[PDB]
RNA sequence: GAACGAGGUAGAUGAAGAGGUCUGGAAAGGCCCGCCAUAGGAGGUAACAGCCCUGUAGUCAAAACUUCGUUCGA
RNA sequence: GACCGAUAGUGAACCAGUACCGUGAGGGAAAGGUGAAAAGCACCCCGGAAGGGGAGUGAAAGAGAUCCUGAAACCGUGUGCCUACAAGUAGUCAGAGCCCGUUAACGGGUGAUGGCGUGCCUUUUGUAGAAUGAACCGGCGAGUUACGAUCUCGUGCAAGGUU
RNA sequence: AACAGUGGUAGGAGAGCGUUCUAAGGGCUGUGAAGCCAGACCGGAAGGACUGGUGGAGCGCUUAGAAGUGAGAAUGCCGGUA
């Protein structure tokens, strides 16, 4: 928890101490797995329906008398084995979301953050000020920081100004300090964190 | 982690048992439900307490006494729990609520005498067991009943 | 659409690429445009009424307008379009240039 | 029983590459290079397009009807 | 949209609540796909036409009006080996002869002749069974979901856990 | 390494194979994918490759997830042909 500090133009200042209780924690493989799975499942809206036998606009009459005919003894026209359809045990509108314990979710977020810290892909960027909405300014910022792949940036106050600049380029996300999760962290492989948000998340956790 | 090597907690995963598909997995033609029994047909189960017309055990047995609306169930707390408080403190139900020793005040706290206690207290409880009272008095506190 | 009947035009894609041409046809119903000297389909012709002809005819066929853009009237290269108002009526202005149409 | 702000109903404006080269019937594709991005939504474009077209982010627009907030007792 | 993609999905992607059936209430279908652009076949020959052969268009005509792909049943034409003194759940294991030459390996096709041998499925104590079902090919077609309960396993906390 | 075992109906238990979509990583594809057709290849099996022909735009692999997930029979339904 002694990662270096970085400026807008890549200049590095004296490193910053981080709460070991949040960033030095040994990551929990399994808890991180379930935490990922959690909202990965809850995100889907799960809207699907297929017309069961009862609601296929038809059926009704016995197609032919029970006995005295060379055909199979049958029921209404809209029945599962018939071509007319009517599915059996099909999908149904249902939610794919649940809840996890407070301790578990806190441990998950702490674990993923500490995993990033030990992998040394965290980059603390104090005071991500920006005077304009223009994207190529922040593209130059990322180039100066050598941020090539996906990334996430959190800046709490400059979110209003910086979100417009960042949102298009090119799949990077701007989130607020309260918006951290497990997928939004893991998926982006590079976390940009402003010092105000450092201590804010530190206090929250 | 990264997503592209997700691995669950091994032993916390099991594939479903897709009954009634082929013979290689057993449970084929019969779907693991025998031959032509009443149990073998859809919705073919029976009432859980049924006994084939032989009168069930519950109905053979007699009924027991009543239950009434009035009932002072007291949140039990033993002396062993009281040790967690410091020396010379005043312990009362409202304090017990925040400290979490009881999650439901209920009809009222009641002190029970199981444990070993050596601390000085002013204990304020709705009821006291005979042994618990003398136990806290020996410990040096005063069992004053609410 | 950006192109208009009676314009000088250059085509972007197809067998015919970047060849100058003049426009007389337009099909906004389906966004197709006819240029001279492009899409030389050879039609097979049975006689039209009293026309005593049987022959192979070479004539234009329409292309999709997306494969088309105009030129800058100043520098001649092939450029995008823009809309501007010149004293009431609107007009067409090519980008990277102040001239109209 | 007025004039006032915001919408709704038609719409307007809207950045950046026929970049070179290879194959091919046809480049939106491969190789090497640029640019815009508050716009990398979507669709079409002779194949898979942020930079080809319609459009998109933002910014505007109403002659006529129409829905919301300000005036006229003990 | 971790919903379907033309037996699906609305009965109905297509002039469908239509054709059709019924006196009537009512029941109730099938049927999507040329090509980028019709550039949809000038002209010639057989033919009454249909339909062909050429020629031409197009990246493809084997792409020509069910017109992208075009499986199987089914129907044909050539053919390498075998077959008119042999009865065969039709195979397998031996096996001469003849023919061919492979994802090269103690190869491929056919097989005169010998040994053995009564299909599959269900249901039954028992089936080759003269007990039942399948004319054949293709598609479709059956133990799920919700809410609770319980048990094993895996997790975070633990005399607390938990919204 | 030694020793022992390895018929199996109803059943119980465990290992897996394949299919459709979804995420992460990788890349295959008009220098011809999917699908179909034919091979004398590989694995203990479900199965999987490789080489040709057709076809003319999409698609495998890797880890995990969720299932309308696997047909030979139901005098099954529909279509086609004996």
Rounded to the nearest 10 degrees, what angle do helices A29-42 and A102-119 cross at? 110
Q: Which residues of B touch A (CB under 8 A)?
A: 1-3, 6-9, 12
Q: Which residues of A touch B7 (CB under 8 A)?
A: 29, 33
Q: Which residue shows structure tokens 């669950």?
A: B8
CA dihedral sign, ordered A163, A164, A166, A167? positive
- Which of strand F's nucleotides are less than 7 A from any protein C-beta? 10-16, 23-25, 46, 62-70, 74-78
Q: Say which residue the tokens 């450029």 belong to.
A: C79
CATH T-level topology, domain B75-145: Ribosomal Protein L15; Chain: K; domain 2 (3.100.10)
Q: What's the CA–C1' distance between A67 and E130, in Å? A: 26
C5: left (phi over 0), alpha (psi -120 to 50) or beta: beta
| DSSP annotation string for A148-196 | -S--EE--SSTHHHHHHHHHTSTT-EE--GGG--SHHHHTTS-EEE-HH
Return the residue matching tokens 């018939």: A82
d(C-alpha C101, C-alpha C91), whole Å: 7
What SS3 state is found at A13?
A: strand
- C14 HSE (CA, 13 A, CB side): 18
Distance, in Å, from the CA atom of B144 to the CA atom of C14, rounded to the nearest integer, reads 101
CA distance C59 to C83: 33
- Euclidean distance between CA atoms C73 and C89, whole angstroms: 20
Question: Which of C's residues 27-86 have CB atoms within 7 A of nucleic strand E?
Answer: 39, 41-47, 54-56, 61-62
Neighbours of B42 (CB within 10 A): 5
CA–centroid distance for A75 within its chain: 49
Give the technique used to solve this structure: cryo-EM
Beta-bridged to residue B75, according to DSSP, are B109
What is the distance between the alpha carbons of residues A161 and A179, in angstroms, rounded to a whole number?
17
- Find chain B residues with C-beta within 8 A of A36's C-beta: 1, 3, 6
A-B CB pairs within 8 A amount to: 24
Element (H, E) at A116: helix A102-119
CA B115/CA B132 separation, integer angstroms: 9
Q: Which of B124, B60, B46, B67 is nearest to B90 (CA)?
A: B124
Resolution in angstroms for this experimental structure?
3.4
Using the Cα atoms of residue B127, residue B132, residue B133 and residue B137 in order, give the sign of their dihedral: negative
Closest chain B C-alpha to A129 CA, distance in angstroms: 30
3-class secondary-structure state, position B128: strand
Residue C2 CA: distances (Å) to CA of C21, C33, C43, C65: 16, 11, 30, 9
Contact B119, B138 (CB under 8 A): no
- 3-state class of A129 per DSSP? coil
Instruction: Give rounded-to-5 percent helix, strand, coil for chain B.
Output: 20, 15, 60
Secondary structure E strands in chain A: 5-6, 12-13, 122-125, 152-153, 173-174, 191-193
The per-residue DSSP string of C8-64 comes to EEEE-SSSS-S-EEEB---BTTTTEE-BTTSS-EEEEE---TT----EEEEE---EE
**Which chains are within 8 Å of A by 3+ CB pairs?**
B
Q: Is the CB of C89 under 7 A from strand D?
A: no
Which phi and psi angles does C89 have, rounded to 5°?
-60, 140
Q: Which two tokens stand for residue A163?
A: 């979100």
The number of beta carbons lying within 10 Å of the beta carbon of residue B105 is 14
Q: Which position has the token pair 């690429």?
A: C17
Chains B and C touch (3+ CB pairs under 8 A): no
Report which of A8, A46, A205, A179 is spatially closest to residue A114, judged by C-alpha positions.
A205
Could you write out the DSSP letters of every residue in B78-114? EHHHHTTS-TTEEE-HHHHHHHTS-S--BT-EEEE--
Is B34 within 7 A of strand E by CB distance?
Answer: no
**How distant is C1' of E71 from CA of A58, in Å?**
34
Check if the beta carbon of residue A199 is closer than 8 Å to that of residue A176.
Answer: no
CA dihedral sign, ordered B50, B55, B61, B66: positive
Count of C-beta atoms within a 10 Å radius of residue A1: 16
């Amino acid at each position: 928890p002694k990662v270096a500090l970085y400026n807008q133009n890549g200049s590095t200042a004296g490193d910053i101490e981080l709460n070991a209780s949040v960033f030095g924690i040994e990551p929990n493989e399994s808890v991180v797995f379930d935490a990922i799975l959690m909202q990965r499942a809850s995100l889907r809206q799960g809207t699907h329906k297929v017309k069961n036998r009862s609601e296929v606009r038809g059926g009704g009459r016995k197609p032919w008398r029970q006995k005295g005919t060379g055909r199979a003894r049958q029921g209404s026209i809209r029945s599962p084995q018939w071509r007319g359809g009517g599915v059996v045990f099909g999908p149904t509108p249902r939610s794919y979301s649940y809840k996890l314990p407070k301790k578990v979710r806190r441990l998950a977020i702490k674990s993923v953050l500490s995993s990033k810290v030990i992998d040394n892909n965290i980059i603390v960027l104090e005071d991500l000020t920006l005077d304009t909405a223009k994207t190529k300014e922040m593209a130059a910022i990322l180039k100066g920081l050598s941020v090539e792949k996906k990334a996430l940036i959190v800046t709490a106050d400059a979110n209003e100004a910086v979100a417009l600049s960042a949102r298009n380029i090119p799949g990077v996300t701007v989130v607020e300090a309260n918006g951290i999760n497990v997928l939004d962290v893991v998926n982006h492989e590079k976390l940009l964190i402003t010092k105000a948000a450092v201590e804010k998340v530190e206090e929250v956790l | 982690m990264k997503l592209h090597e997700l691995k669950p907690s091994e032993g916390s995963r099991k594939t479903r048992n897709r009954v009634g598909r082929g013979i290689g997995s057993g449970n084929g033609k019969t779907a693991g439900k025998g031959h032509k029994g009443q149990n073998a047909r859809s919705g073919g189960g029976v009432r859980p307490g049924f006994e084939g017309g032989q009168m069930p055990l519950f109905q053979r047995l007699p009924k027991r006494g009543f239950t009434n609306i009035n009932r002072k169930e007291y949140a039990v707390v033993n002396l062993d729990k009281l040790n967690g408080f410091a020396e010379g403190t005043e312990v009362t139900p409202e304090l017990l609520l925040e400290t979490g020793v009881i999650s439901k005040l209920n009809a009222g706290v009641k002190i029970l005498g199981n444990g070993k206690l050596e601390k000085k207290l002013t204990v304020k409880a709705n009821k006291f067991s005979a042994s618990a009272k003398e136990a806290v008095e020996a410990a040096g506190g005063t069992a004053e009943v609410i | 659409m950006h192109v208009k009947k009676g314009d000088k035009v250059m085509v972007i894609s197809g067998k015919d690429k970047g060849k100058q041409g003049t426009i007389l046809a337009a099909f906004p119903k389906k966004d197709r445009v006819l240029v001279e000297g492009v899409n030389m389909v050879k039609k097979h012709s049975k006689p039209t009424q009293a026309n005593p002809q049987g022959g192979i005819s070479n004539q234009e066929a329409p292309i999709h307008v997306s494969n088309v853009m105009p030129l800058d009237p100043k520098t001649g290269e092939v450029t995008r379009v823009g809309y501007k108002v010149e004293d009431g009526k609107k007009v067409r202005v090519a980008k990277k240039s102040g001239q109209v149409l």
